[PDB]
Design an enzyme around this catalytic site. Structure first.
Site, PDB file in Angstrom:
ATOM      1  N   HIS A   8       4.019   0.103  -6.341  1.00 38.10           N
ATOM      2  CA  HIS A   8       3.559  -1.161  -5.799  1.00 38.10           C
ATOM      3  C   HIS A   8       2.926  -1.984  -6.911  1.00 38.10           C
ATOM      4  CE1 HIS A   8       3.085  -3.473  -2.149  1.00 38.10           C
ATOM      5  NE2 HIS A   8       1.863  -3.810  -2.516  1.00 38.10           N
ATOM      6  N   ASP A  93       1.649   7.913  -2.367  1.00 34.48           N
ATOM      7  CA  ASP A  93       1.359   6.566  -1.882  1.00 34.48           C
ATOM      8  C   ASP A  93       2.139   6.357  -0.589  1.00 34.48           C
ATOM      9  OD1 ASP A  93       0.299   4.075  -1.692  1.00 34.48           O
ATOM     10  OD2 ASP A  93       1.346   3.227  -3.419  1.00 34.48           O
ATOM     11  N   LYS A 130       0.291  -0.608   8.684  1.00 33.45           N
ATOM     12  CA  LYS A 130       1.720  -0.875   8.466  1.00 33.45           C
ATOM     13  C   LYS A 130       2.567  -0.406   9.593  1.00 33.45           C
ATOM     14  CE  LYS A 130       2.328  -2.450   4.042  1.00 33.45           C
ATOM     15  NZ  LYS A 130       2.772  -1.526   2.988  1.00 33.45           N
TER      16      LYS A 130
END
Lengths: 237, 237
Positions: A8, A93, A130
């Site tokens: 990211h 992650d 999310k």
């Protein structure tokens, strides 16, 4: 550090704040542009030691960051990773896969899958907003192992604000509270079954329609509720 | 004689029995191999007189034989033919269209359509067993005009047998008897409507299916119960 190239912007920002040095993992990809994954060869000691050797000012990595899953939802065989990646802390992650514990489909497919691994601490940083039901800017840090409690608490205090939005905090906890009992299992299984049924008719409407139609990048025969493995003997991926 | 090139083997056999001389009409055709029809230019006096002039031992034709319809069911504008073909007897070999009188769809599309034409005798030789309900080897000769009754009766007696099969004769008459009243009109209209509905779904299934499908050689928009005219401004034919 051993940072995934499929990372990211936040990890790049982290590397610019801190005086660290990378070896970048090398993920695969198809012609579609879907970011696949790192091959099995780049998690063993030989390739890591080689890439350490031809990197200036580089020592043995003390941390590893892996995007599990990718942006397009490709989970890893994380038991392989936690067994063979010889670093003292492996970070996953898992921004796109926070719902892992709540269906046994995803067994062996997160940092928290399996027991406490010996000799290293597994981090997982589920982005709760999310895919679960939580307000935005909500996240979690799950650890697995032994960490210096005061040093890591001070590092957590270092980046967060001092007066947080209690709506976000309450939503962050209520997202996990939606998953205890039979209702959460029913939610996760209903979502997965609905996804699989949508996939079956989009391949069905492809063969029902005339001329062209939308294809969906998935194995040619799916009828079971499992994470369908990407096999070398097939070419759908 | 003026014999259609789109003829039967029987007309060739007739021409080999009798000491006659042909001018052959010249029908059109598509790439499919479907035998279309004679253009309008080859029924007027100029082209007929020309083709008489460049044929040895040929005089003005005293009879004309036209296959109405063709093998693939293409009717003619027979009023044009009966008005402009300047011969004293026009024969329509209507072997494939015997059902003409029994639906007003086919008005102006047979030898017996319209009234008694002046100055010439119209023959029509419906093969009753082909499309109506009759036993095989059944046929009719319908005339329209004035003929020498004894000479033509003797010519009819000349080719038929002397002891006929009365089952065939009874079937030949019962085929017409099936068409008087409301039942015959219901039969013909039901057959035409069923044909049109079959045509509408075969074009519908062509656009419903994937990849290739069977096409049917018919106008792109058919929704009315009529003989759909072959227009020069379209390319389906």
């Amino acid at each position: 550090i051993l940072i995934d190239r499929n990372c990211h912007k936040s990890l790049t920002h982290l590397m610019m704040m801190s005086d660290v040095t990378p070896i970048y993992f090398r993920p695969t990809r198809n012609a579609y542009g879907i970011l696949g994954g790192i091959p099995q060869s780049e998690f063993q000691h030989a390739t890591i030691a080689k890439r350490v050797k031809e990197t200036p000012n580089a020592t043995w990595p003390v941390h590893a960051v892996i995007t599990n899953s990718t942006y397009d939802g490709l989970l890893y065989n994380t038991d392989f990773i936690k067994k063979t990646l010889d670093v003292k802390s492996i970070h996953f992650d898992s921004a796109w896969v926070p719902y892992t514990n709540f269906s046994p489909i995803y067994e062996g497919k997160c940092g928290m899958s399996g027991g406490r691994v010996e000799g290293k601490v597994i981090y997982e940083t589920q982005s709760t907003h999310k895919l679960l039901a939580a307000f935005s800017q909500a996240s979690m840090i799950h650890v697995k192992g032994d960490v210096n409690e005061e040093t890591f608490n001070e590092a957590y205090m270092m980046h967060t604000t001092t007066s947080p939005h209690y709506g976000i905090v309450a939503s962050t906890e209520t997202a996990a509270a939606m998953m205890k009992g039979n209702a959460g299992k029913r939610l996760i299984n209903g979502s997965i079954e609905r996804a699989i049924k949508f996939r079956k008719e989009i391949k069905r409407l492809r063969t029902e329609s005339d001329g062209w139609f939308f294809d969906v990048w998935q194995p040619d025969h799916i009828d079971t509720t499992e994470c369908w493995p990407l096999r070398s003997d097939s070419t759908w991926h």
